[PDB]
Amino acid sequence: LSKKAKASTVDLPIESVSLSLQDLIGYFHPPDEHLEHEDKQNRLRALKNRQNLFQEEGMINLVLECIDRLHVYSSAAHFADVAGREAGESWKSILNSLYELLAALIRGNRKNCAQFSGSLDWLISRLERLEASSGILEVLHCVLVESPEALNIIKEGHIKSIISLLDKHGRNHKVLDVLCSLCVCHGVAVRSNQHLICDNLLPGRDLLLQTRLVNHVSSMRPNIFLGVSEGSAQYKKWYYELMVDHTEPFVTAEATHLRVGWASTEGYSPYPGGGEEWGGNGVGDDLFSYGFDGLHLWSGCIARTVSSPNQHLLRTDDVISCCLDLSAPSISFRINGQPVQGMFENFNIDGLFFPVVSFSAGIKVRFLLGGRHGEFKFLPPPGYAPCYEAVLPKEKLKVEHSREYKQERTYTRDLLGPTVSLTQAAFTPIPVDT
């Protein structure tokens, strides 16, 4: 076929090769564990003698030649075009069966793995191929676990090739197992292999999953829902204050989280959107929340430093004033009565807005909502209104958890279904046509 003889002229025994490969794989089959111990010993002896005879007759080299002369064709469609349709159909299965037969022949045989140590370099060259990746990894694992000589043969380029396979083909644990076999074999540690695998795989932090302990963060909001819509009786300017009565910078190893600002619901539902109910997320970690930590403006989990007189992280005896202007989308902050040289502007105004503070442990902060609920230490800017005015006449204003679930007894916990939309939150009198 390589010399391009006509397809009918050449005889390609596809079916016989496939059946013989299946029979040989079954013939080189490890004993089952549930069998009696002495019978298992007999079957293991038979398998070992079988492998020894095959290796002495040189079956491994013939299998390798078949594998190479099938690998010369890249794809099943290519091999079908070269030889024929049925050959193209059977190409992948034949390659897989040949690789499995090689693995079965060499598995558990110290001598066979010792001879395959020399040819293993050729094997790794086809690692990147999708059709042969699994079989090559299986053969490599067997050879590495059995023969320390092939472990010595393994080099830095081959280690990089295996790591590149981990990168290209995704997360496959067999690659990690092969790497562990490279690191340690027969109770003997290869320092060079360990150092190389470390220095290549670990510092990138791009493949292995990364772990961290993260402080739990909770959100704290009032009842008020503030939305602006065309033809609605909602005042567009609002103002509230928060003072840090007490804060501890480091309750744990991680820094204490403390962010204050406004957040917007998704649609008209009372449920805040865009953020997970539990986790390290807080105000400004999603595009529905807008926060200030005393040094940065937080929005969409991205922080940008803002300048302010005596700028510092939020500490004890700091009065934070947040201003929401929905006539033109604007969120401005003032620390200790001094303006903060930054704003949020041109954000989405479809949903209702509410004050919110996100915090880790070790805080003590108080809402100054204006009017009866709180008092403003700094006068609100002209045109703005205290947030306590937004409370509906019938309801009462509390500060309640923004998310549905809080700490309580497991059986007393109220499981909540989906909530109805807050149609009454925005009052729009629609004209009746007359």
Partner: protein, 107 residues
């Protein structure tokens, strides 16, 4: 090479000086935001002595520019930190190092 911005103010009159060990309690992070070192994790304040090449350059100049009791954010360019060879297994080659450092005390 190193730029410093204050997270928390210090006294502003006591500064590191020759032959005085600096007790710093720091947290190190890569520029992309992945933590690689933290003395707060080990619960051991870090002690180093100025002018004796014990720590990396950018860290040394940042600590020198800091004042007693001042918490500041240190940004170290690759030249003043591990160069282009990097730290094997921890710091990738040509990496910018960000440090949150607090000068607890000076003996």
């Amino acid at each position: 090479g190193v730029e410093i911005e204050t997270i928390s103010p210090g006294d502003g009159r006591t500064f590191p000086k020759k032959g005085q060990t600096c007790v710093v309690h720091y947290t190190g992070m890569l520029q992309n935001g992945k933590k690689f070192d933290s003395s707060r994790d080990r619960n051991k304040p870090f002690k180093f002595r100025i002018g004796k090449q014990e720590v990396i350059k950018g860290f040394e100049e940042g600590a020198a520019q800091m004042s007693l009791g001042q918490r500041a954010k240190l940004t170290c360019t690759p030249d003043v930190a591990y160069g282009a060879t990097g730290h094997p297994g921890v710091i990738p080659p040509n990496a910018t190092l960000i440090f949150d450092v607090e000068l607890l005390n000076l003996e």
